[PDB]
Amino acid sequence: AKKMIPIDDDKLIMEFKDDATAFDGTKKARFKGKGWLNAQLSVIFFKLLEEHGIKTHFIGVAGGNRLIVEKLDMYPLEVVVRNVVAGSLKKRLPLPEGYELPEPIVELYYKNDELHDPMINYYHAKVLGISLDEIKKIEEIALKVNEILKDYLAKKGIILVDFKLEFGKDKNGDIVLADEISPDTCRFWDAKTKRSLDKDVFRFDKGDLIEAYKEIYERITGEKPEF
Amino acid sequence: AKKMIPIDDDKLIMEFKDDATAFDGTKKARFKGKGWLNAQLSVIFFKLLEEHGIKTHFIGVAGGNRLIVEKLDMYPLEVVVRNVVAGSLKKRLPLPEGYELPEPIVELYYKNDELHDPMINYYHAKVLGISLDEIKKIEEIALKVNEILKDYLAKKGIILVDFKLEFGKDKNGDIVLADEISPDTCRFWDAKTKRSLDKDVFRFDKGDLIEAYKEIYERITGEKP
Ligand SMILES: Nc1ncnc2c1ncn2[C@@H]1O[C@H](COP(=O)(O)OP(=O)(O)O)[C@@H](O)[C@H]1O
Ligand SMILES: Nc1ncnc2c1ncn2[C@@H]1O[C@H](COP(=O)(O)O)[C@@H](O)[C@H]1O
Ligand SMILES: Nc1ncnc2c1ncn2[C@@H]1O[C@H](COP(=O)(O)O)[C@@H](O)[C@H]1O
Ligand SMILES: Nc1ncnc2c1ncn2[C@@H]1O[C@H](COP(=O)(O)O)[C@@H](O)[C@H]1O
Q1: How close, in Å, is residue B203 to chain A by CA atoms?
Q2: Taking CA atoms, what residue in A is nearest to B192?
Q3: Which of B102, B147, B154 minimises the CB distance to A155?
Q4: Which one Pfam family would you cite for this protein (chain B)?
Q5: Do A208 and A198 touch, CB atoms closer than 8 A?
Q6: Residues with Cβ < 8 Å from B4, sequence gap 6 or more?
Q7: Which architecture, in CATH terms, is B73-208?
Q8: Nearest-CA residue of chain A relative to B158?
């Protein structure tokens, strides 16, 4: 759903596509305007985080669906933060869908398609060459990011249920937030109705995807989207 | 603005009054219903915090403006948490009123009327007989309390600008949140207009106090007082 176009040693173009994929590509569709929506939401979120002192890969915009981002040496991780029980957490804790967690939960996943992104702990992370000190910094940033996004969205009647982040190292060795932040990579629920406003609408045919993504955008910006 | 009526060794009654005082009692007024509103908001906040595992002195209600609280050995502190630049923080940081802080700020003040509650640090605290370990627990609780109150109020279009907390020790030596939590001890701004919905309305004659306090109550409860 993204194309990464290299510019040079320190920069690249992240291009968002209208393609939607789920269940290892066994389920596919195209949603006109999805890419535009995901790119724009990523811009909103990254700038918001930058305002709070979070270091992100975001440099600028190069078109409706194209972002310019700094090239990073990526950690082979998906860093998942969870505020409300949903998806795979139901397989892990004896709690129902929708349960509000007393504190946010951080899960680490080894980014590996062949092993289907298995969950790992700090010991596994060391074997994969990630020091405990780096892990602690990563989780700390992820939790800060969580609070900013959660609070921002909560004021707009949107529950940040959970989300995945990715991180990399820049030239100076600092840990930098990367990839995307969109309804493709977050679970967003309406505060009142608890309906999904994210990729789960596609994954489980719970409704109209472009409709859901437009809803997020309009609530955040105060404006209907024009792709 | 409160009367503390002792019951026995472990309990007391905190009575909220309609009296309002500012600038060392050089400015005084009475606001019909203020005490009731402060007592009720204190109940709402303490119960909210108790729900999240915060230990508080709140036991129960003994009338519209009377709370039953557990008696504590008080720390001689005001513990102030700040999310948004206002009041005395403007004298300390080169930042305008309304500036949103990247992270919450915790300030300690020594509770002493004659010295007009001066700001202190961890070294001064130790002299006043408060260990660094206690201080760290205090600030940790204060930051937890901040996050719950801020998030709760934000969903209701209210900015938690800053607020004062007080703490004491119970019989078992645990650190327990005490005093009150009300528009007398917090700065609350309307999210859209940024107008004060707290004691600043009285302090600086920015409007109608009872109006501002009723507004807070109605937004929280969904009911007119
Ligand atoms: N649970 C408690 N146990 C003992 N003292 C308390 C408790 N809660 C509050 N206090 C103290 O009771 C007093 C009530 O506040 P207030 O009437 O405004 O007094 P003051 O104006 O001197 O701060 C304060 O001195 C406060 O520190
Ligand atoms: N490979 C991935 N791509 C995009 N988002 C993901 C990925 N893995 C997990 N997430 C997000 O992380 C959260 C938790 O997913 P799950 O573990 O399936 O419950 C959800 O918001 C997902 O959208
Ligand atoms: N700043 C970055 N530098 C280098 N690689 C990145 C950066 N941000 C994201 N990526 C990777 O680019 C790929 C694009 O995601 P996908 O659309 O799943 O192919 C993923 O492998 C990401 O880990
Ligand atoms: N002695 C006090 N009595 C009541 N509230 C206070 C006191 N000191 C500080 N506060 C509260 O803590 C915050 C910071 O106050 P200041 O340092 O006066 O700007 C404000 O919300 C005040 O209402």
Answers
A1: 29
A2: A155
A3: B154
A4: SAICAR_synt
A5: no
A6: B12, B13, B14, B15
A7: 2-Layer Sandwich (3.30)
A8: A155
The DSSP call for residue A99 is: P
Residue A155 has its nearest CB partner, among B52, B102, B155, at: B155
Query: What is the C-alpha to C-alpha distance for residues B108 and B88, in angstroms, rounded to an integer?
Result: 13
Give the C-alpha separation, B29 to B163, whole Å. Answer: 22
Q: Name which of A50, A155, A158 to mutate to probe chain B: the one with the most chain B Cβ atoms within 10 A of its Cβ.
A: A155
Q: Which CATH architecture is the domain B1-72+209-225 placed in?
A: 2-Layer Sandwich (3.30)
Q: Which residue of B has its CA nearest to A100?
A: B52
Residue found under tokens 């030596």: B173
**CA–CA distance, A161 with A189 (Å, rounded to integer):** 7
CB-CB: which of A53, A102, A151 is closest to B151?
A151
Q: Where are the domains of chain A?
A: 1-72+209-227, 73-208
Residue B209 alpha carbon to ligand 4 centre in Å: 17
User: Going by DSSP bridges, is the β-strand pair A77-84/A58-61 parallel, antiparallel, or unpaired?
Assistant: unpaired
Q: What is the CATH number of domain A1-72+209-227?
A: 3.30.200.20
Task: Measure in Å the smallest separation between the Cα of B154 and chain A Cα atoms.
Answer: 6
Quoted resolution (Å): 2.1
Q: How was this structure determined?
A: X-ray
The C-alpha atoms of residue B55 and residue B53 are separated, in whole angstroms, by 6
Q: Can you give chain B as a three-state secondary structure string? A: CEEEEECCCCEEEEEECCEEEECCCCEEEECCCHHHHHHHHHHHHHHHHHHCCCCECEEEECCCCEEEEECCEECCEEEEEEEECCHHHHHCCCCCCCCEEEEEEEEEEECCCCCCCCEECHHHHHHCCCCHHHHHHHHHHHHHHHHHHHHHHHCCCEEEEEEEECEEECCCCCEEECCCCCCCCEEEEECCCCCECCCHHHHCCCCCHHHHHHHHHHHHHCCCC
Token pair, residue A34, equals 């999805």
Distances (CA, A) of B54 to A54, B14, B70, B153: 29, 20, 15, 17
